Amino acid sequence: MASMSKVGINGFGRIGRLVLRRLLEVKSNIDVVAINDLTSPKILAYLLKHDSNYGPFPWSVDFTEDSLIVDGKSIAVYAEKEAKNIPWKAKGAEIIVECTGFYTSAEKSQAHLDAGAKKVLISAPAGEMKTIVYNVNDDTLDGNDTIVSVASSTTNCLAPMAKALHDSFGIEVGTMTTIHAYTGTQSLVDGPRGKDLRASRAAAENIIPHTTGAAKAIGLVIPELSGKLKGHAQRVPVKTGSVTELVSILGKKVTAEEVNNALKQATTNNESFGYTDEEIVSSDIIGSHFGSVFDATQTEITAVGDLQLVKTVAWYDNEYGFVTQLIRTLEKFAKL
Template sequence: MKKINVFINGFGRIGRALLRRLLEDDRFEIVGINDIYPQEQYAYLLQFDSVYGRLRYGVEQKNDCIIVADRVIPLFNEEKVESTALYDLDIDILFQCTGVHLTRRDNQPFLDSGVKKIIVSAPPLDDMPMFIVSINDEQYQGQRIVSAASCSANAIAPVLKLLNEYAGVEAAGISMIHSYTADQKLLDAPVNTSELLRCRSASSNILPLSSSATVTLEKLLPQLDGRIQTHSIRVPVPAGTLYDFSMQLIRPMDAEGLNQLLEHVGYDKYREILAVTENTLASSDIVGDSHGITIEKKRTVNVTDRFVRLLGWQDNETGYVSQMIRLALKVAFF
């Protein structure tokens, strides 16, 4: 079978986590990487990572390429890489990991340069369609520019969809206890935002911050429109997110039945996406996990026969890029 030619535009946290996963998947050929910082930093930050440790392959930067795992990957340093000769690369999927190309208009020049399809690694700012595998990917009809939604939406959506199908979700509140991200400040400093808490040190504070997760989830799960509320709480850890679900169900379900539903039906419907564990976890235990979410079975409780609480974990980088790869397989072969 022909390999899928992919290009990574933006080589920050998500771009590098994505490449680490792609290096282990022989269904993909990485035909290029673009970012605007010095090329020696591409190789250095790929090989050495403060969260994931040292890459198991040697990495060499040479002649505008990275050489890693017997692959020679061309490097670009272009603010507008779409203006270069992307036609020559025969790109099936461009992973848009810059965090700034968030509309269809922003991405159209890449299609004009020969890219076949684009997957954006963030919720869009316009009506760009969003897809999550096993949530709404059956609605994919060959659109050339799509969003993979957000890491949080990829974690929360499987739980909400499954419970709504089998018990009915009357209302759901989800607290996202989220690791800090690269857009936060290490120390207190002014930033160009009206949200004052974003000026505060990510390494020294627990910060309740705004999130687009509620809007994103209601678009992905319109059957739950008006019944979801999320809260983002950033905490001083570099990776890992804990999702605290509080849900009022339409039909009674006890904790044991809920765990069985998640473990057995969830496994059939959301294999590789939703996992259930008997283990008691800390945030560092989820680092490197490729699932969209892992439910901690012992934490599932009933407050009443219809009001339930459960906890789930996600590596918000590895788990998310693994979902992007699953979406790429759907998009590429449509």
Template sequence: MSREALAEGMIPLIGRLYRENNVVTSIHGRSLINKSTMGILKAHRFARRMSKEELLLEETAPLLGVLAELDLGAASIDVARLAQKYKAEAGETSLENFLRAELADVVGKRGADERRSTDVVLYGFGRIGRLVARLLIEKAGGGHGLCLRAIVVRKGAANDLMKRGSLLRRDSVHGSFEGSIQVDEETNTITANGVRIQVIYSDDPASIDYTAYGINDALVVDNTGRWRDEEGLGQHLKSKGVARVLLTAPGKGGLKNIVHGINHTDISPDDAIVTAASCTTNAITPVLKAINEEFGVVHGHVETVHSFTNDQNLIDNFHKGDRRGRSAALNMVITETGAAKAVAKALPELAGKLTGSSIRVPTPDVSIAILNLTLAKETTKEEVNDYLRSMSLHSTLRKQIDYIDSPDVVSTDFVGSRRAGTVDGLATICNDTNLVLYVWYDNEFGYSCQVVRVMEEMAGVNAPSFPAKDAVPTAKVPATV
């Protein structure tokens, strides 16, 4: 009961920091915004499973209380990492003085946000488009950063707008939209949690005048997959009000395939068109980078067991692709994947070292990649798992790599995961230089989170993140399920 009381007391502090200061609080990357009492308790419990360190509400509640009094400017603050650093480094320093020093760049700036707003247009409103919309609405905050202004679709029926709003509201995999949605058929708009989204009907990416809707210098996110090269995607740039384009699929030709956390710094202001690679490439590349840097990868094979997708048939029918015409709901379907080769576009050091294949299975979401690797250096299962757990907490890849060692997890446990991939530590197999890793990934939502991170990089709207550096964890307790 006392823990519940502490969690209840944290909710208004979290809300106030978000609304008045543009501060997003999290626990090991899990946002605390709009969480219930039980959600906050679960987040603290999850921290123990992640880091083997107890995260006490008796420590985080007063920390949030001080943060709320510091009149902060816009920031992203990981409460768990900040609490760990205070325990490890503060010594006799008071909590307030520690936080003032740690967050000196934003203390006293009361909601100041130097980020400029960037208009966003979602071209296509399917599985990825709607999830990206949910994420952008969630991040709307004080109106800075990425601002979802419009979606572009082909009109499918007389009641098209109502159906679009209904599909945003309800999702068979990811659950109901958290908030309110209003549809206005006179203005062709959908308003979700106060975010007014113009719905534009068009089948020609080159002929839309976005400025007529007050949209300027927009970032267009193409979710259709109809065009994969510079010529096709370049059609968007011919429309008034468009500045840049992001493709939510692997690109062709010389387009940069970006995996956030790996090569996002390669994006330059001159890149008018960028692609966010594939969900599988995003899931495996961070883990491969981590393993290659520590143990060296000589060669390997990537096998993905992937949920079915919309390009397959529900029942047997003609399909231009081999095997994909057979019923997705009834069969495991062997198919090709370009993810292994695509890794080399983000990690050139692995060029020619990986092969890959895929099996589509009758599940609607969440996939798993099996990385069968030959290493340059001998190691053990324990050493690999400890290393990857540490990478998931204390490295620059902590937004991409997650880690779990629960004995009963299955695919549905990873629905809604915001990381690119989650290493299943109990499934790791290691024999000297032979290593097999199992990496779960929500091929819809986890990938959408990576897409939004690339969007933020393209728009230059990332808020400062704290703590800037981690402390080395001290107290250890056994992991739990």
């Protein structure tokens, strides 16, 4: 009848918790049987139940000394720093959803397979492996894949828009800036944050320039654009909800309307990628069930003779919206 794959989550963080929320929301056939993090079940249960961005959890949440009990289903809880020591076989976890931020390579995520898992989907960029943005390149997946990435939230915002432009007009070259909600990689107060000096600064009190590979590594998702895009971010003080701008030279001359029509078609019957003509703002994207929502109000054609710059803008809930992509990619990946 139905494919009932068994899933473990490594890192029950902002993304790891929303992975469970979303799986339950869509009545997915996957069963989350295990969770690994660095803390007790009490603390994970508190964090699951009460959420500063998405509000109370829509299901019952309890804990024992070794487990979460979520809508009456037990989920084992482990606390292993090192993934080779995670006992994934004890509850039969075959596809690990890897969200700790510390295993973003084939060699590192390998430890999940040494531990007895069968596959791993990485919730972040992970070098030169298969990297999937759903409804842009998920067809490249097949039965032989064992470690896969879904890139960043910014790649999931960028890829759909860039794909549509490429397919319709060509992109000669382009540059991206995402005005991006602050995340857990930043700092609450001015203090050391590894090697990235700017990341050390109080994230709710500054505009902080910040580097991102969403553009530079786009060719993993859209091969014909390898080397053609660059970009960065500015981290700003909103808790989630992000916007991505892109300034392109296209392969032909365009009008605003024409760009917008082409994107509209591309969003039609597309559960991953949305369209809006409304004068929305970042908080309106919070809880979005898209990876990306193209905003036709922000389209801008600048032109002098045959020279033409095209600016296109796309919103994304870098938290929940990404996660809806991650889950779509996970449902497909899990049944191969």
